Amino acid sequence: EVQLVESGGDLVKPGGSLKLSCAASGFTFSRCAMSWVRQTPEKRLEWVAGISSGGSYTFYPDTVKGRFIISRNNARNTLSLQMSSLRSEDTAIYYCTRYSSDPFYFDYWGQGTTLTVSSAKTTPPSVYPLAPGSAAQTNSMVTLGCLVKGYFPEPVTVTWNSGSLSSGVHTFPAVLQSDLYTLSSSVTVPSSPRPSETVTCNVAHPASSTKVDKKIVPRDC
Amino acid sequence: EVVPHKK
């Protein structure tokens, strides 16, 4: 069954260059034309390069023409995209896509790799706990949570009690303010832990490595 | 060879 898996997106700076790759497995790659379609952070989809089954023919939109080269090793089945003079507009999830037999539409799509083009220097996060705060107030369940502040680029992963706290949580989309993001996540537990049992909150930030496990203890002051 | 968008 068709699988297309891509790798390469990292934080690149403007002026830069990256090369993303895509592995196919599950079908005779050499008879299928292939393509790299991209999803802009505003969710609108743009097609950026398309390639014939033998690597002879190469098609590009006017915006990437000149700066992106697409190619394919039909023997260790990989398809690629080498990206030169990047701009910030090129940020997005790049999708390795497989053209139909009837080559005008795509039938399978890869899982995607984010390329970020920016001049912000990466920063770790500061994770602070938010506890019921004032007098709690007792009525079976309580909302506790994390604030993950001041990191760049995305991603962070928020997990409660290593993954056992799995119901109740909500992990809000990140808002980017002045080149630094902020993200928060809540959790609703019955009132029996937090009292008795530990709620730790576990964020981790890939770019800078950084794992932080804060605990939600009751602040009173 | 299969070429995109050409029959």
Next chain:
Amino acid sequence: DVLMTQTPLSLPVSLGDQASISCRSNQTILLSDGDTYLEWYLQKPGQSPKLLIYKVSNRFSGVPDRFSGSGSGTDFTLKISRVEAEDLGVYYCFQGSHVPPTFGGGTKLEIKRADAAPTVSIFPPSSEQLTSGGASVVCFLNNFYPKDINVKWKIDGSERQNGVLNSWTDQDSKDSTYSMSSTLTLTKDEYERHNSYTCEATHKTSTSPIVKSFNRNEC
């Protein structure tokens, strides 16, 4: 290029009804061999886009017989009939007939449901935060429907503030409600001038604003 307008941008519908998303090109998609290549793709919550209808009426294998596509020349349309909740996602229409192959804007299909009032939760700055001068008062409006919500900050009763972040979730797959977090940020010098912090939120479920608060000196 060939602009593919798509309407409407967001479409509330309730399990059991019909949804028509429709897409339109400013140039014909009909090539001389009589093939009209307008395809419809689905981006579910979290995953990557799937082919559903391809070449205007045909259905790729595995798509339910409730996704049906019609139209010709320049106006095209998808009918999802008897909508079920695992159909929420963004529907994109596309055209491979001319290079470059363009895509439409997207249609979020939203599952309509009975209203739910929010659950406001307001948190005070943590002492940890304060030992570097920041102070961000977080407010959580977890668990509600419709998306449209009003949220205001008032410190001491007077004022209100700009210098805020608001972030909403998508429709929840097992629940169809939304959640949102509003963060109001101040400094230690600002936070220490004041006393009552308030989160004032309003929905369609209630005439008096839903209201959560704390009296500042629990740092």
